[PDB]
Amino acid sequence: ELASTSEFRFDPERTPGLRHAKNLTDESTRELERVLEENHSNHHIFTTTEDHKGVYFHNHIAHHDITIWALGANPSTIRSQHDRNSLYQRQAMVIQDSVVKDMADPAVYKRCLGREENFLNYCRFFEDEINRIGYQAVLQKYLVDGSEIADDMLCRIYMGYVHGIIHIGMALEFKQARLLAEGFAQAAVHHDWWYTEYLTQSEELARKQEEPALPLSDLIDLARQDDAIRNCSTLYYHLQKRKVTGEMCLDLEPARDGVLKNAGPELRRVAARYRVDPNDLERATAELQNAAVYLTAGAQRPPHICAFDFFLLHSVTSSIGHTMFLAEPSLSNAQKARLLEYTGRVFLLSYAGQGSPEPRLDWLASHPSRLPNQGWDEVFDRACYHEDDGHMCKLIRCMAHAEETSRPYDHLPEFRVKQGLFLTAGIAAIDSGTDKPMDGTKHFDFIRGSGFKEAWERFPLRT
Ligand SMILES: Cc1cc(O)c(C)c(C)c1O
Ligand SMILES: [Fe+3]
């Protein structure tokens, strides 16, 4: 199954992922293995120091390179995209082999957590663990077996806007033990303590079963009806400037400083109702994936062009990984259910942070295609040439996957996004794209604070 911990090895037929272009070339695949190893060896998992912008910005190079290979990028496009995103990277941390070995003492493992200088140390520790006990046993030991170490790591994969679970999802999907170690290592060095508190306190509350279980889509809607949740945040988190230089920062963080400060008990009471049925996982997985497209693609405002929220779209891109968790024999139905629950509860926290935008699927559905005769194949190809850090192509590929996992359940009311709206949402995403989507690490094509009317002021009106 999983390629070597020591090397990246992709094949257009053996490792094409759950959703992809037609006719992936060996040439693109070799170029991809080249740039991935350059990225692993030369670039740190964070592209900023924490104090620079106030929160860590993440290295998306692994995710972008893989995604645009999967969508049929030529070797030249892979190189060009990778080279441009390489320019703002931090230099990789040093590996100390004595620390890698000492991390087998749980006291030492625990002492190294939350420290970015340990990123390649943890990568090697996880590569070693995979080779020692195999990946399936790593998932038990470091995620689902309910040890203090596995419960700690289960919260970390969601820290830093769920980049750990995104990385782990991609590793299982593309069958790379080397990317899986990267994933556990990314999670290990995060230190967003409020995720541990929210997910731990929410699981404890859910155990009491005080109110009935709802689909994620119903809980997105329930959050909006709540006075404390709908008012707990502000657009000000996306407009903060440093007093001295006027530079952008996230010194205040919507989740820590807004959602959990102002509406903690109210949100935990909603989160406690996302309880997933172990006997119904194919539908329950597809429903979480639909619900991510609902809250994200739904977050539109007439009379503006369709635009996608930078923070909400990590719900869609994180969501794909549960298709791999579902397909994994070594995980119990109960472990698979718990993973889904954690992901869903984070989706609610993220949604509240962005002002809980009321879905306007009517406005999304009437999106006028900039170009004629666009199907997924045409959208995928345009996503290859979109010059960001990979958010746009991951959003599009993950929505195309949700369309497929939803098709069997298109008649059920808890599936708010119906089959035709997925391609419309894909066209609306690529159509919102411009000729200069980024400047270094700054994004311009995504909205920030879609739930706040003022966020939409710099977005053109639909013609
Ligand atoms: C560009 C960019 C990358 C990131 O990973 C995160 C987390 C933020 C807030 C950003 O603005
Ligand atoms: Fe991201």
CA gap 255, 197 in Å, rounded? 12
389 CA to centre of ligand 1 in angstroms: 10
Q: Assess contact for 43 and 61: CB atoms under 8 A.
A: yes
Q: Which of 189, 220, 248 is the last residue of a domain?
A: 189
Give the sign of the dihedral formed by CA 287, CA 290, CA 292, CA 298: negative
In ligand 1, the atom with minimum distance to the C-alpha of 161 is: 7
Decide if 277 is inside a domain. yes
Place of tokens 């994200």: 296
Contact partners, residue 349, CB within 8 Å, separation at least 6: 198, 255, 259, 260, 267, 271
Contact partners, residue 312, CB within 8 Å, separation at least 6: 295, 296, 299, 350, 351, 354, 357, 450
57 CA to centre of ligand 1 in angstroms: 4
Which residue has its alpha carbon closest to ligand 1 atom 9? 57
In ligand 1, the atom with minimum distance to the C-alpha of 60 is: 5
Structural method:
X-ray
Contact partners, residue 435, CB within 8 Å, separation at least 6: 387
Decide if 272 is inside a domain. yes
Decide if 345 is inside a domain. yes
Contact partners, residue 16, CB within 8 Å, separation at least 6: 24, 70
Decide if 312 is inside a domain. yes
Resolution in A: 1.9
The burial class, CB within 10 Å (0-12 / 13-18 / 19+), for 457 is exposed
Q: Which amino acid is at 102?
A: D
Task: Give the alpha-carbon dihedral of 2, 400, 389, 195, to 10 degrees.
Answer: -70
Ligand 1, pocket residues at CB < 6 Å: 55, 57-58, 161, 441, 443
387-397: b (≥16 Cβ within 10 Å) or e: bbbbbbbbbbb
Residues pairing with 32 in the sheet: none
In ligand 1, the atom with minimum distance to the C-alpha of 389 is: 1
Decide if 110 is inside a domain. yes
- Mark whether 245 and 342 lie in a shared domain: yes
- Mark whether 395 and 250 lie in a shared domain: yes
Q: Assess contact for 99 and 124: CB atoms under 8 A.
A: no
In ligand 1, the atom with minimum distance to the C-alpha of 160 is: 7
Question: What backbone torsions phi and psi does residue 455 show, to the nearest 5 degrees?
Answer: -60, -30
CA gap 307, 425 in Å, rounded? 10
- Mark whether 337 and 451 lie in a shared domain: yes
Ligand in closest contact with the CA of 391: 2
The burial class, CB within 10 Å (0-12 / 13-18 / 19+), for 113 is middle
CA gap 100, 89 in Å, rounded? 24
CA 415 vs. chain centroid, Å, equals 21
Question: Within 13 A of 159's CA, how many CA atoms are on the CB side?
Answer: 25
- Mark whether 244 and 142 lie in a shared domain: no
310 CA to centre of ligand 2 in angstroms: 8
- Mark whether 121 and 81 lie in a shared domain: yes
CA gap 55, 420 in Å, rounded? 38
Place of tokens 């990590």: 314
The burial class, CB within 10 Å (0-12 / 13-18 / 19+), for 19 is buried
- Mark whether 40 and 108 lie in a shared domain: yes
CA 118 vs. chain centroid, Å, equals 22
Q: Assess contact for 443 and 388: CB atoms under 8 A.
A: yes
Number of domains forming the structure of the chain? 2
CA gap 282, 337 in Å, rounded? 11
- Mark whether 216 and 259 lie in a shared domain: yes
Q: Which amino acid is at 390?
A: G
Q: Is 226 left (phi over 0), alpha (psi -120 to 50) or beta?
A: beta
- Mark whether 236 and 106 lie in a shared domain: no
Which residue has its alpha carbon closest to ligand 1 atom 2? 57
Q: Which of 189, 211, 226 is the last residue of a domain?
A: 189
Which residue has its alpha carbon closest to ligand 1 atom 4? 57
HEC-encoded secondary structure of the chain = CCECCCCCCCCCCCCCCCCCCCCCCHHHHHHHHHHHHHHHHHECCECCCHHHHCCCCECCHHHHHHHHHHCCCCHHHHHHHHHHHHCCCCECCCCCHHHHHHCCCHHHHHHCCCCHHHHHHHHHHHHHHHHHHCHHHHHHHHHHCCCHHHHHHHHHCCHHHHHHHHHHHHHHHHCEHHHHHHHHHHHHCCCCHHHHHHHHHHHHHHHCCCCCCCCHHHHHHHHHHCHHHHHCCCHHHHCCECCCCCCECCCCCHHHHHHHHHHHHHHHHHHCCCCCCCCCHHHHHHHHHHHHHHHHHCCCCCCECCCCECCCHHHHHHHCHHHHHHCCCCCCHHHHHHHHHHHHHHHHHHHHHCCCCCCCHHHHHCCCCCCCCCCHHHHHHHHHHCCCCCHHHHHHHHHHHHHHHHHHHCCCCCCCCCHHHHHHHHHHHHHHCCCCCEECCEECCCECCCCCHHHHHHCCECC
- Mark whether 337 and 447 lie in a shared domain: yes
Residues pairing with 3 in the sheet: 176
311 CA to centre of ligand 2 in angstroms: 8
**C-alpha triplet 16, 17, 20: angle, nearest 5°:** 70
Q: Which of 189, 207, 240 is the last residue of a domain?
A: 189
Decide if 16 is inside a domain. no
Q: Which amino acid is at 245?
A: T
Which one, of 352, 390, 388, 395, lies nearest residue 237 by Cα?
352
Q: Which residues constitute the domain of residue 321?
A: 196-458
Which residue has its alpha carbon closest to ligand 1 atom 7? 57
Q: Measured over all CA atoms, what is the biggest interatomic distance in the chain, rounded to whole angstroms?
A: 62
Place of tokens 């990267």: 182
Ligand in closest contact with the CA of 388: 1
Task: Give the alpha-carbon dihedral of 65, 67, 68, 70, to 10 degrees.
Answer: 120
Task: Give the alpha-carbon dihedral of 339, 341, 343, 349, to 10 degrees.
Answer: -150
For the chain, the distance separating the N- and C-terminal CA atoms, rounded to the nearest angstrom, is 50
Task: Give the alpha-carbon dihedral of 201, 207, 211, 217, to 10 degrees.
Answer: 70
Tokens standing for residue 63: 């995710």
155 CA to centre of ligand 2 in angstroms: 17
Decide if 168 is inside a domain. yes
Q: Assess contact for 459 and 450: CB atoms under 8 A.
A: no
Question: Within 13 A of 84's CA, how many CA atoms are on the CB side?
Answer: 19
- Mark whether 178 and 203 lie in a shared domain: no
442 CA to centre of ligand 1 in angstroms: 8
170 CA to centre of ligand 1 in angstroms: 19
Count of Cβ atoms closer than 10 Å to residue 27 Cβ = 12
- Mark whether 176 and 107 lie in a shared domain: yes
- Mark whether 184 and 213 lie in a shared domain: no
CA gap 252, 454 in Å, rounded? 19
Decide if 10 is inside a domain. no
Tokens standing for residue 450: 């879609």
In ligand 1, the atom with minimum distance to the C-alpha of 441 is: 1
Which residue has its alpha carbon closest to ligand 1 atom 3? 57
